[PDB]
Design a protein around this motif. Structure first.
Motif, PDB file in Angstrom:
ATOM      1  N   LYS A  59       0.845  -1.182   0.000  1.00  0.00           N
ATOM      2  CA  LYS A  59       0.000   0.000   0.000  1.00  0.00           C
ATOM      3  C   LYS A  59       0.885   1.239   0.000  1.00  0.00           C
ATOM      4  O   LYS A  59       1.850   1.311   0.761  1.00  0.00           O
ATOM      5  CB  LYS A  59      -0.929   0.000   1.219  1.00  0.00           C
ATOM      6  CG  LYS A  59      -1.843   1.209   1.257  1.00  0.00           C
ATOM      7  CD  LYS A  59      -3.057   0.991   2.135  1.00  0.00           C
ATOM      8  CE  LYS A  59      -4.054   2.130   1.958  1.00  0.00           C
ATOM      9  NZ  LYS A  59      -5.357   1.816   2.606  1.00  0.00           N
ATOM     10  N   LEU A  66       1.012   5.653  -0.009  1.00  0.00           N
ATOM     11  CA  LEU A  66       0.367   6.944   0.182  1.00  0.00           C
ATOM     12  C   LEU A  66       1.253   8.105  -0.293  1.00  0.00           C
ATOM     13  O   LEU A  66       2.482   8.017  -0.298  1.00  0.00           O
ATOM     14  CB  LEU A  66       0.001   7.158   1.657  1.00  0.00           C
ATOM     15  CG  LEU A  66      -1.120   6.286   2.227  1.00  0.00           C
ATOM     16  CD1 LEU A  66      -1.506   6.816   3.604  1.00  0.00           C
ATOM     17  CD2 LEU A  66      -2.330   6.287   1.303  1.00  0.00           C
ATOM     18  N   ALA A  72       3.993   2.167   2.399  1.00  0.00           N
ATOM     19  CA  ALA A  72       4.973   3.226   2.137  1.00  0.00           C
ATOM     20  C   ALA A  72       4.319   4.604   2.017  1.00  0.00           C
ATOM     21  O   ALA A  72       3.246   4.744   1.422  1.00  0.00           O
ATOM     22  CB  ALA A  72       5.774   2.910   0.883  1.00  0.00           C
ATOM     23  N   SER A 100       8.888   6.746   4.065  1.00  0.00           N
ATOM     24  CA  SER A 100       8.903   5.918   5.250  1.00  0.00           C
ATOM     25  C   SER A 100       8.149   4.655   4.892  1.00  0.00           C
ATOM     26  O   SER A 100       7.285   4.666   4.016  1.00  0.00           O
ATOM     27  CB  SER A 100       8.252   6.638   6.427  1.00  0.00           C
ATOM     28  OG  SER A 100       6.912   6.970   6.142  1.00  0.00           O
ATOM     29  N   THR A 101       8.511   3.558   5.536  1.00  0.00           N
ATOM     30  CA  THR A 101       7.858   2.293   5.257  1.00  0.00           C
ATOM     31  C   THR A 101       7.677   1.489   6.534  1.00  0.00           C
ATOM     32  O   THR A 101       8.518   1.526   7.429  1.00  0.00           O
ATOM     33  CB  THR A 101       8.659   1.484   4.220  1.00  0.00           C
ATOM     34  OG1 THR A 101       7.952   0.286   3.882  1.00  0.00           O
ATOM     35  CG2 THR A 101      10.050   1.136   4.747  1.00  0.00           C
ATOM     36  N   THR A 102       6.540   0.811   6.636  1.00  0.00           N
ATOM     37  CA  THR A 102       6.271  -0.013   7.801  1.00  0.00           C
ATOM     38  C   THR A 102       5.712  -1.344   7.323  1.00  0.00           C
ATOM     39  O   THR A 102       5.268  -1.478   6.174  1.00  0.00           O
ATOM     40  CB  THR A 102       5.271   0.656   8.788  1.00  0.00           C
ATOM     41  OG1 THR A 102       5.397   0.044  10.076  1.00  0.00           O
ATOM     42  CG2 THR A 102       3.835   0.467   8.326  1.00  0.00           C
ATOM     43  N   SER A 131       9.801  -0.706  11.037  1.00  0.00           N
ATOM     44  CA  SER A 131       9.621   0.484  10.224  1.00  0.00           C
ATOM     45  C   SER A 131      10.836   1.395  10.250  1.00  0.00           C
ATOM     46  O   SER A 131      11.643   1.348  11.173  1.00  0.00           O
ATOM     47  CB  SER A 131       8.411   1.259  10.762  1.00  0.00           C
ATOM     48  OG  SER A 131       8.204   2.477  10.079  1.00  0.00           O
ATOM     49  N   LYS A 170      -6.830   5.219  12.101  1.00  0.00           N
ATOM     50  CA  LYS A 170      -6.095   3.969  11.940  1.00  0.00           C
ATOM     51  C   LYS A 170      -4.745   4.142  12.636  1.00  0.00           C
ATOM     52  O   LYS A 170      -4.044   5.131  12.401  1.00  0.00           O
ATOM     53  CB  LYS A 170      -5.897   3.691  10.444  1.00  0.00           C
ATOM     54  CG  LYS A 170      -4.994   2.518  10.101  1.00  0.00           C
ATOM     55  CD  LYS A 170      -5.605   1.182  10.465  1.00  0.00           C
ATOM     56  CE  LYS A 170      -4.753   0.019   9.974  1.00  0.00           C
ATOM     57  NZ  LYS A 170      -4.565   0.033   8.496  1.00  0.00           N
ATOM     58  N   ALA A 191      -1.855   6.939  12.032  1.00  0.00           N
ATOM     59  CA  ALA A 191      -0.722   7.177  12.923  1.00  0.00           C
ATOM     60  C   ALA A 191       0.106   5.908  13.112  1.00  0.00           C
ATOM     61  O   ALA A 191      -0.434   4.802  13.205  1.00  0.00           O
ATOM     62  CB  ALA A 191      -1.195   7.717  14.266  1.00  0.00           C
ATOM     63  N   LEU A 192       1.422   6.074  13.089  1.00  0.00           N
ATOM     64  CA  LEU A 192       2.365   4.979  13.280  1.00  0.00           C
ATOM     65  C   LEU A 192       3.110   5.314  14.571  1.00  0.00           C
ATOM     66  O   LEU A 192       3.761   6.350  14.661  1.00  0.00           O
ATOM     67  CB  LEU A 192       3.350   4.918  12.112  1.00  0.00           C
ATOM     68  CG  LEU A 192       4.411   3.826  12.203  1.00  0.00           C
ATOM     69  CD1 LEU A 192       3.776   2.450  11.993  1.00  0.00           C
ATOM     70  CD2 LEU A 192       5.480   4.076  11.159  1.00  0.00           C
TER      71      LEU A 192
END
Ligand SMILES: O=C(O)Cc1cc(I)c(Oc2cc(I)c(O)c(I)c2)c(I)c1
Ligand SMILES: O=C(O)Cc1cc(I)c(Oc2cc(I)c(O)c(I)c2)c(I)c1
Lengths: 121, 120, 120, 120
Positions: free
Chosen positions: A9, A11, A103, A111-113, B108, D8, D102-103
């Motif tokens: 995904k 953004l 991303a 940034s990526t998680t 992350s 989220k 939010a992360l």
């Protein structure tokens, strides 16, 4: 728990919207250590890329997910900093899991998680 | 000596600079291959200095690789990523100063570039 | 030069420090209302120094507000956020040095804290 | 099902949704005072739906507060922030759909907004 084996995904932090039509290339490292094409596609209007791989095809190993961020920004008239954005990780080494690689893009930053979840099966 | 290329890493779990993060910088060659350009480990400040000089840091595509896997493992944490790489074109129009910043978490990471020049 | 509380702001769109960003620091009172503690604007480096001193920066809850709306508006962009704010309890334990870092985009921002050890 | 406002939250340390995070939403008044608008907690998906409706979610300045401190403390972690606040103007330019993402990390967080046009 996500039903997708490998979800990607993306953004857009400049527009606060999904990053549509981002070309995504996934590779799988082989025994000899070389990268081979695994799956390919482009993000939809939602910014998500569905259909990369079934659990059967998603074997244990190291994977490389490449986002063509350069073409994405250049198409908008912006000269970005990065050549592309790459996410490399080991998958399914302790049983099958479902992965979501997210991303967030900016011309000079990204940034990526990852969200890892264990399916019902 | 001079520092046209800098790498700064922070740890989002401990809220401090990321110390001893192994960094390897490569430069794309004439026929598309990667050649070792510079290397080192982040200091107590989370910064890596003395990577190169303005004379050595010429125009081209560069790859900065942070060994985030080893960093987290040595902290007793099993991270998600094998490493974090930043690939970019540099000095295509003159000679600027580049700072590659990175923020790390087990699952992350974020990276940003700060490009500067002798402003007046 | 600053020591106890520092603020660093970067621009993720332009790849540079966020200059002249208005910063306001508030502090909780005995009752429970915010109170002006310090203010300033980020310099060319994107940093704001001299907000306070170890003497006046006592233990308590602080609020750092960054005027991101004005920053983006001046560039012709209509950002999402009214502003970016960081709320935290400081020096509750020991009197260390705090650095509030912020990376800005029109529809997104990330903030990180770097708390440095008073001993070593 | 939700539509106007969605929240989220993700956990960068565990690589999973941030479940049971308390969310409080406030709306600014004529004189500039904040009043309760909606509240809830993130589900297993890390999402919070049904906070409001299109008729209820009118034009104005909203404040979304995520109780990140309680989330981390419950896990035994000592976080930096008291909470994460997201302040923004909504539906000023037509009734759209807003997603506040939010992360979270113990000493850092990033927030992003996804604004979309429903039946526009
Ligand atoms: O910042 C980072 O380093 C990683 C990151 C990237 C994205 I992009 C995020 O945003 C979303 C928004 C929606 I809507 C989703 O469904 C998902 I999954 C992730 C978040 I939070 C965190
Ligand atoms: O050169 C120095 O003196 C050190 C230095 C340089 C930069 I550039 C900084 O800014 C940020 C802001 C965010 I948000 C980050 O995630 C990161 I990594 C760095 C900071 I604090 C400290």
């Amino acid at each position: 728990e996500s039903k997708c084996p490998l979800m990607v995904k993306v953004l857009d932090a400049v527009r606060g919207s999904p990053a549509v039509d981002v070309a995504v290339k996934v590779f799988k490292k082989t025994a000899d250590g070389s990268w081979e094409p695994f799956a390919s596609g482009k993000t939809a209007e939602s910014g998500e890329l569905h259909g990369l791989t079934t659990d059967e095809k998603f074997t244990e190993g190291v994977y490389r997910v490449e986002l063509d961020t350069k073409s994405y920004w250049k198409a908008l008239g912006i000269s970005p900093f990065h050549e592309y954005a790459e996410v490399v990780f080991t998958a399914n080494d302790s049983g099958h899991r479902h992965y979501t690689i997210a991303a967030l893009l900016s011309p000079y930053s990204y940034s990526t998680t990852a969200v890892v979840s264990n399916p019902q099966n």
